[PDB]
Amino acid sequence: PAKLGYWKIRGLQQPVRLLLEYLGEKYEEQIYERDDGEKWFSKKFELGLDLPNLPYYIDDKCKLTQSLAILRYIADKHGMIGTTSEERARVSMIEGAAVDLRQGISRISYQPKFEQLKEGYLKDLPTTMKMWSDFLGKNPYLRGTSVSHVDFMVYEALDAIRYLEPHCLDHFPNLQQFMSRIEALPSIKAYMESNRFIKWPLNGWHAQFGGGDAPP
Amino acid sequence: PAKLGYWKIRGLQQPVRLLLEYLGEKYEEQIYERDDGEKWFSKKFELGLDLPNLPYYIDDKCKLTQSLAILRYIADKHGMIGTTSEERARVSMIEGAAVDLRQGISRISYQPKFEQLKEGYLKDLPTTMKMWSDFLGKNPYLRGTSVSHVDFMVYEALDAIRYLEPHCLDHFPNLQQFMSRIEALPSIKAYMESNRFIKWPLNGWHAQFGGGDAPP
Numbered sequence: 141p142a143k144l145g146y147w148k149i150r151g152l153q154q155p156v157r158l159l160l161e162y163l164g165e166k167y168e169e170q171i172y173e174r175d176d177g178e179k180w181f182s183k184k185f186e187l188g189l190d191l192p193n194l195p196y197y198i199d200d201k202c203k204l205t206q207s208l209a210i211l212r213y214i215a216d217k218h219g220m221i222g223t224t225s226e227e228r229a230r231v232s233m234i235e236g237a238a239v240d241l242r243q244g245i246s247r248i249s250y251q252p253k254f255e256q257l258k259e260g261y262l263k264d265l266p267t268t269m270k271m272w273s274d275f276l277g278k279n280p281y282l283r284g285t286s287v288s289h290v291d292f293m294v295y296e297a298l299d300a301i302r303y304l305e306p307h308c309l310d311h312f313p314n315l316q317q318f319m320s321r322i323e324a325l326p327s328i329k330a331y332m333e334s335n336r337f338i339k340w341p342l343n344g345w346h347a348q349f350g351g352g353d354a355p356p
Numbered sequence: 357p358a359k360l361g362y363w364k365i366r367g368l369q370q371p372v373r374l375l376l377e378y379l380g381e382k383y384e385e386q387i388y389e390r391d392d393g394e395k396w397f398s399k400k401f402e403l404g405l406d407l408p409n410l411p412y413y414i415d416d417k418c419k420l421t422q423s424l425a426i427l428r429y430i431a432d433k434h435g436m437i438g439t440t441s442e443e444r445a446r447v448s449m450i451e452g453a454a455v456d457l458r459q460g461i462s463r464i465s466y467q468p469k470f471e472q473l474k475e476g477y478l479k480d481l482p483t484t485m486k487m488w489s490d491f492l493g494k495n496p497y498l499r500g501t502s503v504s505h506v507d508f509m510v511y512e513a514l515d516a517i518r519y520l521e522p523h524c525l526d527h528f529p530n531l532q533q534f535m536s537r538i539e540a541l542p543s544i545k546a547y548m549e550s551n552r553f554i555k556w557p558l559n560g561w562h563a564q565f566g567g568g569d570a571p572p
């Protein structure tokens with residue numbers, strides 16, 4: 141079983157957990173609690189990682205850092221990366237846009253001026269959602285009929301944003317169905333009902349938004 | 357010839373230009389000047405791009421956005437992405453860390469409080485440089501004896517940081533040699549001596565740092 145290391149939050153690791161649960165990969169999570177900073181910063185350079193960071197992934201074949209590299213390793217091993225250069229590039233494009241979507245809310249949430257930034261962010265949100273709604277179109281998933289790691293990235297990003305603006309998906313029925321479709325996948329549904337599931341926080345505990353001890 | 361679109365700055369597009377020049381790919385750059393905002397937003401949704409953004413890449417086979425997706429497409433076509441899942445993941449890990457390196461300086465540079473943030477950033481820089489110095493080790497390039505897209509990513513990131521802190525590489529001779537090695541590559545040296553080379557600005561024109569009309 142691979143060892144995964146990360147804070148006890150959703151943040152960057154959630155899409156990886158979801159993917160691991162979807163393809164039935166056995167893994168052990170090394171959870172770092174709110175007060176484990178010292179614990180991490182003391183072993184950070186003792187784990188044998190080339191470029192130390194959280195999250196990290198370790199198994200008999202690989203030692204990795206970088207949330208996207210970790211997600212793509214599991215996806216690669218399961219044939220979800222793309223078979224041609226054009227396809228692999230299109231996949232990377234979707235990942236990049238998904239990173240932008242999640243990082244956008246992350247940026248303003250860790251900002252002391254969150255309250256101020258929030259208004260501008262909410263003003264632009266609609267255009268962003270439309271772009272994604274138009275991209276998904278009539279497809280069940282981002283790349284067609286089959287689920288892949290990008291779906292779990294976008295799903296998590298949308299779920300986090302709906303915590304800030306609950307009606308953000310109201311005018312986009314396909315995005316709403318997309319969310320339900322993911323939550324209805326047998327392996328996902330079961331994981332979300334387990335005690336392994338981390339529902340909160342969305343961001344780091346110290347965030348102006350999404351960092352409480354409980355949902356707002 | 358592929359068409360590349362981006363602002364007339366280094367920013368996110370520089371590593372792509374460098375790579376295109378290294379493998380001899382013919383391309384046409386659609387440059388957006390400091391006052392071309394309107395020029396971009398007016399047709400941004402008219403270009404047929406799935407997820408509109410700058411930079412964008414267009415050729416007879418592909419239409420892409422996302423700087424990393426674009427860089428990886430060219431790299432993929434040239435066999436620099438990796439042959440196994442473990443190798444491709446390791447490559448992605450390096451890319452992610454390189455993105456972190458460049459985005460770190462980018463973050464504080466577009467921040468109005470740049471002047472304040474600068475001190476904290478400079479305090480941590482040494483640790484970051486050491487991490488990269490240790491990673492490169494005795495290798496001529498990040499992945500061994502052969503240059504790849506990641507080298508141009510890290511090179512550009514280090515060059516940008518040396519503009520903020522000129523002695524940041526002083527205690528890391530291998531990183532210094534790495535920089536020289538890249539600049540000594542025949543295709544790179546020639547490109548940097550051409551009139552196609554964009555030397556400044558590093559960040560967007562309106563950045564607190566690296567956004568002037570000329571170097572500081």
Ligand SMILES: N[C@@H](CCC(=O)N[C@@H](CS)C(=O)NCC(=O)O)C(=O)O
Binds near residue numbers: 152452
């Ligand atoms: N680009 C990196 C970002 C990693 C990162 O910022 N990790 C944060 C939490 S989300 C951290 O606590 N890192 C620990 C450290 O820097 O030592 C990734 O995608 O993994």
Ligand SMILES: N[C@@H](CCC(=O)N[C@@H](CS)C(=O)NCC(=O)O)C(=O)O
Binds near residue numbers: 236400410421423
């Ligand atoms: N994650 C994206 C970021 C793209 C981005 O932020 N582009 C900026 C300039 S660096 C821009 O002007 N985009 C135009 C737009 O959003 O319409 C990437 O790596 O390409």
